[PDB]
Design a protein around this ligand. Structure first.
Ligand SMILES: Nc1nc2c(ncn2[C@@H]2O[C@H](COP(=O)(O)OP(=O)(O)O)[C@@H](O)[C@H]2O)c(=O)[nH]1
Ligand SMILES: Nc1nc2c(ncn2[C@@H]2O[C@H](COP(=O)(O)OP(=O)(O)O)[C@@H](O)[C@H]2O)c(=O)[nH]1
Length: 307
């Protein structure tokens, strides 16, 4: 997992590690990292990362932060240190404008808390909504799901079977109905039951009459979501970022859930998407089980591309 990312960063380290070693050689208790050393290794890194599927802007940012961290620092003659700076850079690129803490922004929030999901078909949206509902239930929160994917045959029943498993109520209409009205209903429902949170499952493809971005706009306006979450399939690579970009201009994205990390041998998008969109990754999907969802933390990520 994130193997490719891990190996290209490890390659860069040992490479700078070699050209310092050489000065150690032309040798004075300490040694300094110079540009010449980095610039070249950095140039290789660029090409490596761009092959691991990291977005251009993120490779340019990493390069800046890595160079700054390395050039000038003195070392002792006779790895851990160089990797430290790289690790720092990665952390910082994973940092976002804002932070979100879900459990605390709901306890605080005036109920019901409305979360709207957006994403292209096959990204794990419905599954992810089922996982989050179960997660919020496990932490003392009452939740209900809106079946607003109304034009894809079977999606309502597909969601119904997910929600039975986890024992969550699904508010729906029927096939052919108005996606926004279903969600409006689910919200009105929760106001009356005094339910903590509503989650909205949404369409993932364009229809004869429709355009998906138009549809998400419509729903967003009717529902006034407290939070908009983009769901993207890690395996899809940089395509994930261009997808989020599209959704972000129709309806602003507040948070991200990436799925299928269990099968992501690359990691380039997971590293780049939070920076490109300026929204935090809140959870990651790591399987098809309803508990295969994990609150995201920089440490869990770094712990996976380094040690
Ligand atoms: N391996 C793996 N598969 C996942 C994960 N999340 C979703 N899936 C699978 O992706 C497929 C499509 O998911 P679905 O929720 O129907 O996607 P949707 O079209 O975006 O709603 C299903 O087979 C899910 O089991 C994950 O974290 N890991
Ligand atoms: N689609 C749908 N909407 C519901 C359901 N239950 C409640 N609602 C919404 O909740 C609103 C009223 O909530 P409620 O206190 O149960 O009853 P009411 O005030 O007499 O309508 C209705 O206008 C519905 O839009 C439901 O099972 N399905």
């Amino acid at each position: 997992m994130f193997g490719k990312l891990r190996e290209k960063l490890k390659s860069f380290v040992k490479r700078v590690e070699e050209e310092v070693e050489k000065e150690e050689e032309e040798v004075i208790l300490t040694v300094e990292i110079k540009e010449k050393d980095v610039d070249k290794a950095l140039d290789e890194l660029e090409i490596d990362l761009l092959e691991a599927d990291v977005a251009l802007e993120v490779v340019d940012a990493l390069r800046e932060k890595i160079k700054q961290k390395l050039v000038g620092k003195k070392v002792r003659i006779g790895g851990k240190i160089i990797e430290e700076a790289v690790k720092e850079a990665v952390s910082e690129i994973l940092e976002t404008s804002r932070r979100i803490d879900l459990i605390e922004e709901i306890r605080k929030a005036e109920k019901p808390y409305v979360i709207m999901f957006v994403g292209f078909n096959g990204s794990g949206k419905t599954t992810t909504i089922a996982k989050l509902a179960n997660w919020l239930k496990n932490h003392g929160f009452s939740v209900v799901i809106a079946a607003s994917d109304t034009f894809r045959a079977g999606a309502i029943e597909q969601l119904e079977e997910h929600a039975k498993r986890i024992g969550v109520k699904v508010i729906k209409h029927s096939y052919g109905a108005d996606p926004a009205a279903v969600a409006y209903d689910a919200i009105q429902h929760a106001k009356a039951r005094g339910i903590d949170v509503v989650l909205i499952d949404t369409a993932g493809r364009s229809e004869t009459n429709r355009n998906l971005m138009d549809e998400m706009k419509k729903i967003a306006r009717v529902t006034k979501p407290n939070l908009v979450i983009f769901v993207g399939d890690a395996l899809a690579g940089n395509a994930i970022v261009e997808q989020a970009r599209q959704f972000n201009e129709a309806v602003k994205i507040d948070g991200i859930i990436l799925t299928k990390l269990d099968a992501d041998a690359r990691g380039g998008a997971a590293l780049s998407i939070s920076y490109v969109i300026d929204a935090p990754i809140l959870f990651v999907g790591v399987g098809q089980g309803y508990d295969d969802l994990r609150p995201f933390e920089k440490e869990w990520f770094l712990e996976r591309i380094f040690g």
